[PDB]
Amino acid sequence: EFSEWFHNILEEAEIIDQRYPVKGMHVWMPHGFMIRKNTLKILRRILDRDHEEVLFPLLVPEDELAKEAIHVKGFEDEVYWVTHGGLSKLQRKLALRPTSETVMYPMFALWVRSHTDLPMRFYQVVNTFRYETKHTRPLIRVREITTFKEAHTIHATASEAEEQVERAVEIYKEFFNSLGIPYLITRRPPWDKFPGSEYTVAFDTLMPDGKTLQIGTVHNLGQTFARTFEIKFETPEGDHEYVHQTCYGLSDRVIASVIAIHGDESGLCLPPDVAAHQVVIVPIIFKKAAEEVMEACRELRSRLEAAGFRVHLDDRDIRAGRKYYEWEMRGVPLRVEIGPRDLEKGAAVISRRDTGEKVTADLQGIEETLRELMKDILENLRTRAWERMESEIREAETLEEASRIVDEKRGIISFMWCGEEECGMDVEEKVRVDILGIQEEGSGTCINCGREAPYRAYLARTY
């Protein structure tokens, strides 16, 4: 039911057009692009506090790409290769970046010299490529990840590195909270960690179809890559030690989930700071004081722009009903309606998208009424969102109880686990599900093998 809803809203709201001749690569239409634009603004505002945006190349040569042991093995047959330059065969294959470690790190080897240079914190929003699962999924599983934000950091000590992982996690919480997106943070099993890292911390959110979606990962690379690409630095004494690195990223999935999580029957419902417009003004007219209703709306439009609002005056010549539907299915948070009556009173009608509540405010200070309203809509959407998720995270003591709950209610399954490879794999097979990750807490007994369970683990069916 969700799948269809999703696909339809993507088309109706004109977010992306999937009709491109190459499976797994979609086009961002104007509206979609605007949402992507605002989502990225929120993100960069956070990231730019302590990160320096850069922009590295798209292509990587075998020499560099395969310089890693596990990492190269992790994307082995998942990389696209350019082999010819025109009609001639390049004397060195070039791979489209799946992620940029092998692109930036050799460059980092150069940029890093003294401890005075560290720490360095960079990030970029580029397009990456990954040849994967025949099942192509709009903004969730694409071949061309059009909005891949990857951040990479460099530190002097393993200590600061771990500290960074913490900082990153806080950055994502803030990012997500701004989008009103709920999430579960866990430590992925050592066999799922980013190829070559020490460990991976992942953020998973819940889709309306009871399935889980990885919406962000942070990885502690320790000195593994440092040694691979020779990234050393001079200590205050005069020694040469390898740097400690971390990296983390998000993709178009962040946009997928904002659309999905605050979904609706009316269409899109987005956080005010993400919508293409925060306030759409709809003038009501039937050839009665029209010239006055209009000039009232225009005055308002201008007035709102000057206050810093992404406003749009819909003065098209169509029934106000159709207008309501359109801006509503597109996710505009606030609709301001003005007609002869209200007008001849110094007031208007403000309608919420998340609730539907129409209220009456005085155009004589409406600017502040709207801001409050916007703050209110996010909190509500964020709240509702969290309730809906937590109410789907269910505990299980029996491996059988799990299978029942998963199959019948979907959602997330909380449980105690020993944290062993074989035991974990066994759990997944028997339940046909994936172990998202762990959360260190008080002991217990592994839901499967009954041995001592040091971890609180989560389980669910993912994307």
Reading across the β-sheet that carries 244-250, which strands appear in turn?
A: 52-53, 120-129, 144-155, 244-250, 212-222, 199-206, 184-187, 434-440, 455-460, 412-417, 393-395
Q: How far apart are CA 346 and CA 338, in angstroms?
A: 10
Q: Shortest gap between Cβ of 38 and a second copy (angstroms)?
A: 12
Q: Shortest gap between Cβ of 192 and Mg ion (angstroms)?
A: 5
Pairing of the two strands 212-222 and 244-250: antiparallel
Does position 252 interact with ligand P5A (CB under 6 A)? The reply is yes
Q: Tell me the C-alpha to C-alpha distance, in Å, between residue 222 and each of 52, 168, 197, 247, 263.
A: 21, 15, 7, 10, 39
Q: How far apart are CA 456 and CA 159, in angstroms?
A: 25
Q: How far apart are CA 438 and CA 456, in angstroms?
A: 6
Cβ closest to ligand P5A, residue 121 vs residue 277: 121
| Span between the terminal Cα atoms of the chain, in Å | 16
57 and 46 in contact (C-beta within 8 Å)?
no
Does position 328 interact with Mg ion (CB under 5 A)? The reply is no
Cβ closest to a second copy, residue 37 vs residue 432: 37
Using DSSP's 3-state secondary structure scheme, residue 459 falls into strand
From Mg ion, ligand P5A, a second copy, none, interface partner of 78 (C-beta below 5 to 8 A by class):
a second copy
Q: Tell me the C-alpha to C-alpha distance, in Å, between residue 211 and each of 258, 406, 412, 440, 457.
A: 15, 10, 8, 24, 17
Does position 434 interact with Mg ion (CB under 5 A)? The reply is yes
Which listed residue (253, 262, 330, 410) binds ligand P5A by CB under 6 A? 253
Q: Shortest gap between Cβ of 168 and a second copy (angstroms)?
A: 19
Which listed residue (310, 444, 449, 454) binds Zn ion by CB under 5 A? 449
Which listed residue (11, 25, 160, 266) binds a second copy by CB under 8 A? 25
Does position 249 interact with ligand P5A (CB under 6 A)? The reply is yes
From ligand P5A, a second copy, Mg ion, none, interface partner of 290 (C-beta below 5 to 8 A by class):
none
Site size for ligand P5A (CB under 6 A): 20
From a second copy, Mg ion, ligand P5A, none, interface partner of 364 (C-beta below 5 to 8 A by class):
none
Pairing of the two strands 144-155 and 244-250: antiparallel
Please report, as residue ranges, which positions from 106 to 145 form the binding site for a second copy (by CB under 8 A): 106-107, 110-111, 122, 127, 131, 144
- Torsion sign (Cα): 387, 217, 276, 15: negative
Which listed residue (4, 77, 265, 372) binds a second copy by CB under 8 A? 77
Please report, as residue ranges, which positions from 99 to 128 form the binding site for ligand P5A (by CB under 6 A): 99
Q: How far apart are CA 453 and CA 424, in angstroms?
A: 12
Reading the block at residue 453, the tokens are: 């369970």
User: How buried is residue 145: exposed, middle or buried, by Cβ count under 10 Å (0-12/13-18/19+)?
Assistant: buried
From Zn ion, Mg ion, a second copy, none, interface partner of 288 (C-beta below 5 to 8 A by class):
none
Please report, as residue ranges, which positions from 34 to 63 form the binding site for a second copy (by CB under 8 A): 34, 36-37, 52-59, 61, 63
From a second copy, Mg ion, Zn ion, none, interface partner of 292 (C-beta below 5 to 8 A by class):
none
Q: Shortest gap between Cβ of 188 and Mg ion (angstroms)?
A: 9
- In one-letter notation, the amino acid at residue 48 is D
Which listed residue (71, 130, 352, 353) binds ligand P5A by CB under 6 A? 130
Q: Which residues of 393-414 are buried (b: 16+ CB within 10 A; e: fewer)?
A: ebebeebeebbebbeeebbbbb
Does position 273 interact with Mg ion (CB under 5 A)? The reply is no
Cβ closest to a second copy, residue 85 vs residue 450: 85
Q: Shortest gap between Cβ of 450 and Zn ion (angstroms)?
A: 7
From Zn ion, a second copy, ligand P5A, none, interface partner of 446 (C-beta below 5 to 8 A by class):
Zn ion
Does position 33 interact with a second copy (CB under 8 A)? The reply is yes
Instruction: Summarize as ranges the residues that interact with Zn ion (CB under 5 A).
Output: 418, 423, 446, 448-449
